[PDB]
């Protein structure tokens, strides 16, 4: 929360759908990091079927800016809750207030020109407590599409690869959920057909010496962008109508 | 050429403590207290969590049916779990606890070589009638700050994908300050006494702190020493 | 620094500038050299001079 | 870590002919055709050339003499 | 109002204190304005710019 | 920052701690400053080989 | 990223000047050559005097 | 847990009254730990020995005049502070000056006591003009551990500190894969009573004789 605000935070944390307000008043029937069942009050319910307010929070969705949006509860089991009270907090929301940044203990003083022009000098304690460790969610998908030499294949049988890489794929060459990877690793093993190569004679001599035949297929292989390393949290598969699904599908 | 020794050792709170040394020459206080507080706030034995695994939790970005806390928020508190191991080096604990009610930090099985310093700490709030968890904490000793981002290079091949890593922080010390005053003594006109007010975490006792600190300090003089 | 350049040459002027920078930053840091709300001195004559 | 070439320019003060000559010499030492004239204190050919310029033991004229010698050297091996 | 909020919180009136250098140990002469502030981490991470 | 540090050093007030005395030169003047016995803005006159 | 290649890179950088440019290039000084200094992280260190 | 121990990586000395030493590798912060500690030691607590109090026989005033000396009183007074005295095994030796010759007065025109060594013989304590200028003052020297001014003590500023200037700088340290380590670099000058090398060793020894009340192994 902002240690020094203007009160106008609630006016923006409740307006943005990032929050989750309570419609009907009651007492919390069940809290969880997935759903929140609110037992509506007898004096504040419809005279038929009586319902309840069963809320469903969002969990770790990729924002338009590749950042992370997620809602977390703020009330424990069995607690009185009126209407207009934040049943759960989302990204940059602290119990109803707009949590834009963080509270940093600043001290105006030069320090060996380490700040010289406008540069900022931060303590090691800050980067230790993970108070600025913002989470991001990239969305990189593979597309097996028909080509001039036949349709591509999403098989884990990739040529010119190692056994240490294909160890993080399934029987269909699709990265295991949760398995942490880094840039250069394979997430979707795909190969595109490519015939009529006609290598140079010097290579043909190699193919005759060590008996290393050349595959008629190229490599597609949706691989993690170099520079960023993360964890797989969702894997979706959309197969065209007609074409029978694979195992992972 | 007076040689100081500890005189006052009173630890007011479990974490907050104080120590003191009188026998100092002209302004030797500053020179000692600053160069000592540095070695304290940087290098200290400590122990902390490094490896954590839960029943079917594959990644920190997930939710378990029954826990009102998020897995990320669980490890976020696991970093605040103070412990102390002596005999072994790396120890695998075992935490099993079910039923509604906040999970105390002592809900873990007691091993032969372990001792908690604050079981009142919170790990995760259970809210379901039949919510049960099974985890095995992996605690070990170290020094300084070690984040999990650079931890995965020594390679060790963690085969179970269900193994999650937590940011390590081996830091017995929390905060330290020093002060100097003019205190009369037996055979001297005017000198200075040095008081060191520190903030531990409950893991390391305040004695070994200054002891091993001065030890490591002296070790850096090996460039010009043999045996005094 | 300019007189240094056109007295001793290029080679001396370079090291002179580098040294000036290091020493400056160090001293400007340890001098405190900050700013607070009280630093701004509102002339107590302001009220009158205004009206 | 050659920082300033002031004295190196003093020998040929043109600021460009310096680069041309030093590049010829740096080639001689890098693209194997010759050996260094100064103790190579791990210095790259780029810097060693400038150092040879500084000492005054290398320039356009001297290299033009050496190459002219090797011109007849290459003709004294064909009977 | 701030000056009084400081006196209530066992804090100085000028909002300035003394600061001690971590390395040297001596205090920076000439008081130093310290305290808290709201810092914003703009979406300009170098890990995406470089 | 640089000009500020230099200007701060090349200042003088009138009553700095130990002003008006004499020293051998820069070595001793720095021995006075760092020790914490003398100030930095004293009007002290010393010897210097130019 | 084998360990030996870091020392190899330090051997190739040794006296190998590089060029730094600021986005609007008004005068010729907008592009200046510096001597590489290998550093950790992702930020480019620049000399304040320049 | 173990640690990282330094080893003198290089050493250099232009002269005997000045020298530079470099200790690498190091540990983060430690480059300032040792620097600050050893620096304070070789500034404000170090034995040496030197001039403390002096009086003239011609006139008794630090601002008066003299008949025969083209110099000023406080001038010779300061020159006294600039005197490298090394007493062997005695505490305080009050020596006297006795010179009346036409020409400068070096540090050899004094009364050599039992054990009083002067490492600056050609040192100029005064300049003497013509005819005679019979001048014989009585200088007093003392021991001490550090620097003590003359006002907080004719009055003379006693400079017992065997060093004239200390300085240290921390820099990067390339250790095979270690990201950012320290490399301590000390640059120290003396006055003559002792050479740098041994004096650095002496201060660093005072440190160990201070912390010797704690160690395990």
XYZ file of C-alpha atoms in Angstrom, chain D residues 5 8-9 12-29 45-46 49-50 52-53 58-61 63-64 67:
34
model
C 48.659 8.434 -29.271
C 52.803 8.596 -31.818
C 51.339 11.390 -33.933
C 54.307 11.900 -38.391
C 51.876 14.546 -37.297
C 49.120 14.113 -39.855
C 46.657 12.043 -37.724
C 45.694 9.980 -40.800
C 49.003 8.899 -42.322
C 49.575 7.568 -38.810
C 46.612 5.233 -39.233
C 47.623 4.160 -42.752
C 51.231 3.382 -41.762
C 50.261 1.686 -38.497
C 47.742 -0.439 -40.413
C 50.384 -1.563 -42.908
C 52.674 -2.516 -40.013
C 49.871 -4.131 -38.003
C 49.117 -6.266 -41.061
C 52.783 -7.249 -41.292
C 52.607 -8.543 -37.735
C 49.278 -5.837 -33.302
C 47.172 -2.654 -33.489
C 52.410 -0.857 -34.563
C 51.722 2.487 -32.856
C 56.965 1.107 -33.221
C 55.833 4.461 -34.629
C 58.966 2.464 -38.208
C 57.201 4.764 -40.686
C 56.172 5.006 -44.341
C 59.732 5.512 -45.626
C 58.628 0.173 -44.651
C 58.914 1.352 -48.266
C 59.351 -3.920 -49.088
